[PDB]
Amino acid sequence: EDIFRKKRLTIMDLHPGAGKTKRILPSIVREALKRRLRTLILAPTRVVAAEMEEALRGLPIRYQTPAVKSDHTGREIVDLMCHATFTTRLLSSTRVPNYNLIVMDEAHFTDPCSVAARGYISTRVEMGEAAAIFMTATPPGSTDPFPQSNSPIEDIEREIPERSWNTGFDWITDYQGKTVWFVPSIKAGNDIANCLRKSGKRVIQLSRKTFDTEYPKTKLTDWDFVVTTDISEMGANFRAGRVIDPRRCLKPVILTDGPERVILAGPIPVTPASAAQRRGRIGRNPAQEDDQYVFSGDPLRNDEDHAHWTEAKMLLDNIYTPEGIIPTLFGPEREKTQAIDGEFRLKGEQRKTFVELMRRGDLPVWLSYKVASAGISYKDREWCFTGERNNQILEENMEVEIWTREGEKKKLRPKWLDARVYADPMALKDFKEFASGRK
């Protein structure tokens, strides 16, 4: 009603399962179409976008790939894209439309590109150019781990194995229904999934990189356990009876004591918002009344040292605005770290390189910023090899060595050390491909 008025930013914070995605958003879109508004819908991931455009099956929805920088048809159409696609387009295009209504679904997503998107959108709204709707059961500052739900949930607090077990946890395997198990890391998930698989359990693993291909498999009944990272907090719909949640995550932190680096701290306790979102995967079905949330430990609200707050600013400082509008993070997320105006603004080829390192090289934001602001070209991989001794990367205790594009053998020893590029087997493989200049 007033939600369509420019300069309004609405936080739709109805409880998990309430129907924000599948009933309320469709209504908003049908009404936006009636008012002839230029509408953008943002989904956390590709497969969720795919689920969104079936809830909107009657309507003129156009999914937008990030392989395309802009797509203007000149017709009445509603654009649908991932959070990251939007921020990627803002970094590389000028022809980003003046959407006057922007809905972010699952607006609790704390991935840097999502935080950056919210910052951008809030500013567009404040300019009087747009109205905006952020949809999430857990907006910034959320502290209630046990929000209301469609059907009753049994909250069971008990010990949960961190790794492979052999005895003392019969309740895990004797349970008769389907379970979603949130683990802090891919390695932790690998361990757990293999322990369950030896007992004859069918397991699907989910992480950020495999979500788009693995998540669809969970839509079948041909499984017993899902073992997932925090990616499933973003609007993932499961038909399950139980969540297991030791409430642990890894958190990237930029250390500034001496040589600046990114570590993965933890496992540490999750935020209340994360715990609520994990719990909120169950109790979704009014017909199904004895869902369980099995958990361990209390949340920790203070995530102020999380790298993602800085990284969002790095992105935002490089998305262009009129003069003199200053880029800024949205709402209370603005208060996570100290803002410094223009701190991360890059110019010329340094900026182009920054974007390319993230897009083409699939490098973390901080790492890309570090390389780009040193005046290093995208294709110049020498920095992968010229780090200090403590930056030597190890795989199975042994020193990782790389055959380079030019037919040279070099020890993998990056000048800037970001723990995320070797945090797991797939991450390390990718970084090895990058260091060898095969992308």
Ligand SMILES: Nc1ncnc2c1ncn2[C@@H]1O[C@H](COP(=O)(O)OP(=O)(O)NP(=O)(O)O)[C@@H](O)[C@H]1O
């Ligand atoms: N594909 C589906 N088929 C049948 N029911 C579904 C399907 N997807 C979702 N649901 C149910 O539809 C109801 C509302 O879903 P939804 O619109 O995603 O709620 P929500 O508010 O977006 N949840 P959340 O994002 O966790 O806060 C829930 O009971 C879901 O379990």
Ligand SMILES: [Mn+2]
């Ligand atoms: Mn939702």
